[PDB]
Write an enzyme that holds these catalytic residues in place. Structure first.
Site, PDB file in Angstrom:
ATOM      1  N   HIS A 109     -11.299  -4.135  -1.688  1.00  0.00           N
ATOM      2  CA  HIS A 109     -11.010  -3.667  -0.454  1.00  0.00           C
ATOM      3  C   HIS A 109     -12.492  -3.921   0.477  1.00  0.00           C
ATOM      4  O   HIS A 109     -13.367  -3.522   0.066  1.00  0.00           O
ATOM      5  CB  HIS A 109     -10.560  -2.335  -0.306  1.00  0.00           C
ATOM      6  CG  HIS A 109      -9.908  -1.818   0.739  1.00  0.00           C
ATOM      7  ND1 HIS A 109     -10.588  -1.293   1.956  1.00  0.00           N
ATOM      8  CD2 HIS A 109      -8.553  -1.781   1.305  1.00  0.00           C
ATOM      9  CE1 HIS A 109      -9.885  -1.057   2.917  1.00  0.00           C
ATOM     10  NE2 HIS A 109      -8.741  -1.508   2.803  1.00  0.00           N
ATOM     11  N   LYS A 165       2.050   4.825   0.588  1.00  0.00           N
ATOM     12  CA  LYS A 165       1.645   5.713   1.973  1.00  0.00           C
ATOM     13  C   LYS A 165       2.592   6.829   1.701  1.00  0.00           C
ATOM     14  O   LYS A 165       3.752   6.604   1.389  1.00  0.00           O
ATOM     15  CB  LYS A 165       1.923   5.077   3.146  1.00  0.00           C
ATOM     16  CG  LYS A 165       1.328   3.698   3.387  1.00  0.00           C
ATOM     17  CD  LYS A 165       1.648   2.783   4.595  1.00  0.00           C
ATOM     18  CE  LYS A 165       0.746   2.997   5.675  1.00  0.00           C
ATOM     19  NZ  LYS A 165       1.448   2.718   7.054  1.00  0.00           N
ATOM     20  N   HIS A 196      -9.495  -8.764   0.967  1.00  0.00           N
ATOM     21  CA  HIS A 196      -8.905  -8.718   2.400  1.00  0.00           C
ATOM     22  C   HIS A 196      -9.495  -9.607   3.110  1.00  0.00           C
ATOM     23  O   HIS A 196     -10.805  -9.530   3.259  1.00  0.00           O
ATOM     24  CB  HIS A 196      -8.879  -7.173   2.801  1.00  0.00           C
ATOM     25  CG  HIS A 196      -7.921  -6.413   1.999  1.00  0.00           C
ATOM     26  ND1 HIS A 196      -6.868  -5.653   2.735  1.00  0.00           N
ATOM     27  CD2 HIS A 196      -7.959  -6.021   0.698  1.00  0.00           C
ATOM     28  CE1 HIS A 196      -6.279  -5.047   1.546  1.00  0.00           C
ATOM     29  NE2 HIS A 196      -6.799  -5.115   0.556  1.00  0.00           N
ATOM     30  N   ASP A 203      -4.916   3.218  -2.122  1.00  0.00           N
ATOM     31  CA  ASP A 203      -5.604   3.288  -0.848  1.00  0.00           C
ATOM     32  C   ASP A 203      -7.016   3.393  -1.067  1.00  0.00           C
ATOM     33  O   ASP A 203      -7.442   3.806  -2.137  1.00  0.00           O
ATOM     34  CB  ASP A 203      -4.825   4.377   0.226  1.00  0.00           C
ATOM     35  CG  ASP A 203      -5.558   4.180   1.678  1.00  0.00           C
ATOM     36  OD1 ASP A 203      -4.820   3.302   2.189  1.00  0.00           O
ATOM     37  OD2 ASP A 203      -6.560   4.643   1.731  1.00  0.00           O
ATOM     38  N   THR A 248       0.685  -1.144  -0.004  1.00  0.00           N
ATOM     39  CA  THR A 248       0.130   0.115  -0.102  1.00  0.00           C
ATOM     40  C   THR A 248       0.918   1.194  -0.006  1.00  0.00           C
ATOM     41  O   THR A 248       1.789   1.390   1.059  1.00  0.00           O
ATOM     42  CB  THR A 248      -0.666  -0.039   1.060  1.00  0.00           C
ATOM     43  OG1 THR A 248      -0.306  -0.263   2.333  1.00  0.00           O
ATOM     44  CG2 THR A 248      -2.080  -0.897   0.989  1.00  0.00           C
ATOM     45  N   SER A 308      -3.063  -8.090   5.115  1.00  0.00           N
ATOM     46  CA  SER A 308      -2.481  -6.770   5.293  1.00  0.00           C
ATOM     47  C   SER A 308      -2.755  -6.250   6.625  1.00  0.00           C
ATOM     48  O   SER A 308      -3.855  -6.381   7.210  1.00  0.00           O
ATOM     49  CB  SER A 308      -3.164  -5.958   4.031  1.00  0.00           C
ATOM     50  OG  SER A 308      -2.537  -4.505   4.184  1.00  0.00           O
ATOM     51  N   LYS A 349      -1.062   8.343   2.775  1.00  0.00           N
ATOM     52  CA  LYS A 349      -2.458   8.381   1.927  1.00  0.00           C
ATOM     53  C   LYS A 349      -2.717   9.519   1.459  1.00  0.00           C
ATOM     54  O   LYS A 349      -3.772   9.807   0.776  1.00  0.00           O
ATOM     55  CB  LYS A 349      -3.584   7.954   3.049  1.00  0.00           C
ATOM     56  CG  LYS A 349      -3.827   6.423   3.173  1.00  0.00           C
ATOM     57  CD  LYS A 349      -5.135   6.029   4.154  1.00  0.00           C
ATOM     58  CE  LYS A 349      -6.303   6.931   3.700  1.00  0.00           C
ATOM     59  NZ  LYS A 349      -7.545   6.785   4.239  1.00  0.00           N
TER      60      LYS A 349
END
Lengths: 444, 108, 444, 444, 444
Positions: C275, C156, C308, C184, C154, C360, C158
């Site tokens: 997600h 980052k 996820h 994200d 991911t 995650s 965000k």
């Protein structure tokens, strides 16, 4: 973790998005630490500074907790107030704001429960969203209805009726006196009753009732669909056949789909009824979830002409303030802060039109004076059981409800205490309405 | 005991057979003239062998009946263009197609 | 109320939809009464027989409670098993099934809490939904990746990265060794970074990394949008630029929108990463909500290639069974009933392809042998902090993660107990990988 | 009934549609009566003159039987020749002609069996239909293949192969030497292998084989679909990915769908392979059905570049004439009447291009000299078992088949009796081809 | 060959597709061998195991013969029962199922004849297909017709009528009393009468008859076209002009085209009449073909509101069971196994609506009491000759048929044996109907 994302001294800007979280933390953890944790996980999600962090303005792009308050009557919980810059969100995206606020913070392991109580939408962000397609006053102008609350009914049973039989329930309900009938949240297109046949027979019944009564009629035709293409097709067919109002499930259907449908409704001049199915899995728990007032703000931002808000009379006299507060949030242009009613932030709506309040569930002719006194004229009263359970039929039940409504409205206009004199007013009305009299006899 | 297939470039009809000698080329030309087809000679680069249109050697031998002259023209094409792939064709006017088409030299 | 909607003798049909509700009733109310109440309010919603009820086959079109079981360790709650005919729902509508199940029952006032634990989807209803666009095996064939779990990251922070800076994080992450990077759940199109610039620069970075590495690369480009039109436009642009995978938020975006996007992905050959944002407001409370296993079934019915599911290692050794059970629900073709793992119904999936499991959140090189042993090859491991926090950069962190993954996979293939010998295996791998060595030194 | 619809003296016009019916009548019924019965029921369907009959030109709009012939060797059957005006049919509708001819006459109760043996399509009606999209010569020009029959192969098993595994069978088959591979009539889009993945992986394999060989390659991608929309979508996707040829099932899929697909193929420059699935339920019975020569005429009228016609070698030497006759019907511009070969009418095709003949089913390297001698260069030879059953693999089997084909073609060109010297020619070729040698060793 | 594809012990799954084949084998060949041969050639098509076979699950992806039964009265034939996994077929593709079942098995050389007697469609596969667009009950609700069979008529002659003359036959037929008129299977668009002029004049006549009678009227406008584009254009024009019903030839037009048209009809609310042209070339031969009950199952799976099933009275009293069995297959929700009626498998249809039964061919006022007693109210009776041959005209014939129908329906409702008292009932009705009286006088 502490000094970085919570600033007691910070004064929130008028364009900042403010959120209030009821934190029920694990015993022993610091209140300021938990507040900064919600602020961080709802804005950036991490504390470990990586090399990509130094490429950005860390002082700006972060949510900060600026105030912590005790929860009255609950020593195990505290209120965390967090300010978010308007730059953190897509303009005109309730989906993006909702995701940023509630994506991961509710899975925080250092708190026993997290509730999102209130969210402040600044006028700058409010002006970007489309809002309700028509609004209360425009809908009243279109339907040529003034001076009284609107009447609705949910067609029951939820299962088994063919298109023609459902239409022949809707027709009697409308010709009896109700302004609207309602498709159930379950009915979009089932094997026993397809959506196109629903729309055709419902439009036939509505037109017949309008012709035979002389009043504008409508049916919240459900366009909630597995796909946005199917939803748009159903809404377009409703417009083509001339249905003045449709219905959507804005939570189960989705906020993106609801926003798209609301924009389409504003474009095509079709009224939008909103049902709040599933809201209980979210807003019921007192220590974990997102409040129905926040859901109401989100819905009116997304777009909708009607919204279920509860019957108010269904709660005790000492538990009505939060419902009244979110009613004011839905209907009024500016709602001052009110801790007693659960309004944590001053909420300025500007020119965005209000949304009709829908009261439904276990209410009949006896609750009606209280319903009128509480809701006022700008509301829709739904009578599923109170109309279909009438011994003389749907038309007689609708006539009873309409006569009771008109009598209560006139009594309120005359200056009488309609709640104190409800039985006398209803009896006096029943002296001229046998259907109403037998309705009270049934539901006493 | 099984043997692996060795992959290599191929050149349409008769390319999976050993390269033809003068006798076999003469037999093919005799077949072409016996079917009433007009023999033709084309050449193009090895990298451009997949071209739909090759360079045309002189003109199609309409009414030609002497396989010796056909083969001599093939050899003259080879001599004039020694790095070029050379193809022998036979025109079928009634069908507006080619009754026979194969390469004589596979290039280098 | 009792005799009408609960039948102890009823044997549920193989085409019936079965639902298990954990009812925490108000003290003193009858268990069978509460079970019939959930069954009725989830199917018909009323008990008072009206004249329209007699027009239908009441014996057929109703949900019935057929079994009540005690909850082990909780004397204040009981399990209610309810059977629903397949005729009650739109064919191929997870939205309609979900609405019918959870529209109003969670607002029941005679129970203190209601949890939907498991739902049985019969093969007849399963065969109607599109399901995952590609599935695990088809995705593996397309990406030319076998014999090891996939690696993701991911990007980052965000907030704050421009299109080019986000791309120059993605490029180093991919060229370091990760198979995928992840947008994200907050990033769809913000003022600081617009979605088209995101897609263009991300595709440039992915192509450059693929060219410089020799392995197929991808980025879950977020297409969650305020409107289905915008979502479809973003997905079409991703396909046009050649992005092999996109990402959607299936809860906040909506089930209808997710189903439409999954159908589009199946049509256009684009992989779909899912997600699970907001899932905690729903599945966290032990006494009120809908379980993540039910959410997983709903998601795989709607369509998706990744999902996820949690890191598994993030819970104690005695609390892993439910996570493993819903992992099996997501991945396997047939999951037998298992009360220890929380599988209440035999779930036959037929030919519907499985969905990749995504782990995650707070996991790094040390958790990795346990992650491999628990998840197997058919999973995606995401390293946001474990890659971006590397002192030598994103590429070095990705190389460390990839080397650790390959070493652990080879150790498992050799027959070693990778969890017992994890430190030794990682040290032996680090003897040839300075990046990996410094990664363990950082995250020890 | 007699004098009205059968005229012995009638001379059929050059624009008339002529049909030959083998009538196996019930014993005792009149031959002329049965002939008039087929003529009437195939044209008007009744004998009782109603008042609406007098409003039309009854002498014109009717089918008439003009000749009755004995069936050689069958005293229980006779041949009925019927003439139909061209005005009785939609212009360019094989569907309408087929319906008018075979709608009800086969259900006639006064005959024990009815067979449609031959149908004469006049040049006037022939000029209206689109016919084959490309034709033999145009397909040869496009594929750059001359002087030899084309080679094909059916990928087996019909069940179980994923997209990549099916592609990795197709790739070896094509790189071995076959000009084409063939999708089975069962494979359009199954749960184990979806059509889009089929098309993508097949195109990848075809491109790789073409690049590695230097010869144009193709795969008959099956576009037979439940709906014409799905069929057109699959064909458009095949064109988009660059597939040069597709396949349709023209009987099970339907004549209307086949005509539409053929018109689309002619418009878009995509070759069309036609499979004759189900043809046996129609053309096998000697006393009841419609002949495969009539089906071949119908198919070439509708449109198609390839067509299965049988292996010819699969029948005895004394039963090959009908197969050769319908081969000539499919390929040649003008086929004179030939009772020995089953050609009952002179069939003038004008400028309509021929259709490639496909021989498939239980044929290998040994049948090949006979196949070449019988079919000529304008045919496609399919080797499913003869290629996949090769002990060294698909590529080796394809190489063996190609070497045998080239050797047989050269032997025919040299003037040798290839059928008489087949073993010697194949052995001489095998002296330079170990794959071919082991192929004969396997299939001896 | 034997042990591999036939398992006596195998118990077929509820999701398995079951097929019953009447095998008339060549003398001397083994029954189990022939059963395995049909099973293999209908599923995989080969016995020689190739290297690609080992890449798949051979135990799963194959059809297996599990039972062999003697044929009563035929020692030369036996019944083969074969089970097919649901995974072998495209979901919702009658085309794919039909192709897989009948592609090559009927060309088997080791059997003298092969008949497909019955096919079991599991509820799981049934739930995927769209089925009839409207169904019997929905069509009755739309047309406002209850309590009696519907009346139809085929406009004759099949040839010669201009658009206006055909319309002036349809107008008198409809105004006489028939609920519907019927376009012939030959009439789609001919030079003497174009389809657009047909649709316009037919709609004019239908509207005039409806206005002059007071009953809903319709005409099965034929949309069978050479191309699906033309068919969709004709159906769209019919909807635009307001035609309530159209007609398609589902065999000659094609199953793919019929499925697409049925889906369009369900989408657009247009009724679909299905004609069974060509069915005799397939279902007439007792030893080779596919049964009309299987064709009826296929048609109702594809979609259609009406279907020709035969007049039943046209056969002897001892040969009516198979016709009644496929009538029950077409109309009823669940048909138990019945060997006497030819129902070999229990066929569960679930919620799929039934299809109206159409009786047509050589039936008049005298057959009518028997027709009513056999078919019941849920049927359509077609009177081509029995209406057009009336000496007083089409209107008088239609009035006679309608009066006879109403009299027979009332007699059945009164509890009389209408078949035993048919002459008395018809005479009593004719005492008030001169048209009916002269109709019996004509057709006695």
């Amino acid at each position: 973790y502490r000094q970085t994302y919570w600033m007691p001294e910070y004064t929130p800007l008028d364009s900042d998005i403010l959120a209030c979280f009821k934190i029920t933390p694990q015993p022993g953890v610091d209140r300021e630490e938990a507040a900064a944790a919600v602020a961080a996980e709802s804005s950036t999600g991490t504390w470990t500074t990586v090399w990509t962090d130094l490429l950005t303005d860390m002082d700006y792009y972060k949510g900060r907790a600026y105030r912590i308050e005790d929860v009255p009557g609950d020593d195990a919980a505290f209120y965390a107030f967090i300010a978010y810059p308007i730059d953190l969100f897509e303009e005109g995206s309730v989906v993006n704001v909702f995701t940023s606020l509630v994506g991961n913070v509710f899975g925080f392991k250092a708190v026993r429960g997290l509730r999102l109580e209130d969210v402040r939408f600044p006028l700058a962000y409010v002006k970007t969203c489309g809002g309700p397609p028509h609004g209360i006053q425009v809908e009243r102008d279109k339907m040529n209805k003034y001076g009284r609350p609107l009447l609705g009914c949910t067609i029951k049973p939820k299962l088994g009726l063919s298109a023609k039989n459902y239409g022949r329930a809707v027709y009697e309900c409308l010709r009896g006196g109700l302004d609207f009938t309602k498709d159930d949240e379950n009915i979009n297109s089932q094997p026993f009753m397809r959506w196109r046949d629903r729309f055709l027979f419902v439009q036939d019944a509505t037109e017949t009732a309008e012709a035979q009564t002389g009043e504008r009629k409508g049916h919240y035709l459900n366009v909630t669909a597995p796909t946005p293409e199917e939803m748009y097709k159903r809404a377009e067919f409703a417009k083509e056949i001339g249905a003045p109002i449709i219905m959507h499930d804005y939570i189960t259907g989705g906020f993106t789909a609801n926003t798209g449908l609301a924009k389409w409704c504003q474009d095509n001049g079709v009224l939008l009824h909103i049902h709040r199915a599933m809201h209980a899995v979210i807003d019921r728990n007192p220590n974990h979830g997102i409040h129905f007032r926040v859901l109401t703000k989100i819905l009116r931002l997304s777009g909708g002409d009607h919204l279920h808000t509860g019957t108010v009379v269904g709660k005790l006299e000492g538990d009505r303030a939060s419902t009244l507060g979110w009613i004011d949030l839905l209907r009024e242009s500016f709602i001052p802060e009110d801790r007693s009613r659960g309004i944590f932030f001053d909420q300025d709506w500007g020119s965005m039109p209000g949304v009709f309040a829908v009261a439904s569930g276990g209410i009949h002719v006896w609750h009606m004076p209280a319903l009128v006194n509480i809701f006022g004229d700008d509301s829709v009263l739904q009578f599923g059981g109170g109309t279909l359970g009438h011994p003389w039929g749907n038309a007689a039940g609708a006539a009873a409800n309409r006569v009771a409504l008109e009598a209560c409205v006139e009594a309120r206009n005359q200056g009488r205490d309609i709640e104190k004199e409800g039985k006398e007013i209803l009896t006096a009305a029943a002296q001229h309405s046998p259907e109403l009299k037998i309705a009270m006899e049934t539901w006493k | 005991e099984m043997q692996d297939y060795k992959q290599s470039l191929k050149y349409e009809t008769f390319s999976y057979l050993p390269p033809m000698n003068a006798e076999r080329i003469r037999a093919q030309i005799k077949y072409a003239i016996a079917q009433g087809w007009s023999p033709g000679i084309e050449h193009v680069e090895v990298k451009n062998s997949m071209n739909q249109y090759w360079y045309m050697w002189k003109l199609p031998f309409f009414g030609e009946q002497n396989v010796d002259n056909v083969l001599a023209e093939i050899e003259a094409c080879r001599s004039a263009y020694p790095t070029h792939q050379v193809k022998l064709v036979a025109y079928d006017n009634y069908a507006q197609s080619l009754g026979l088409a194969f390469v004589v030299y596979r290039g280098n």
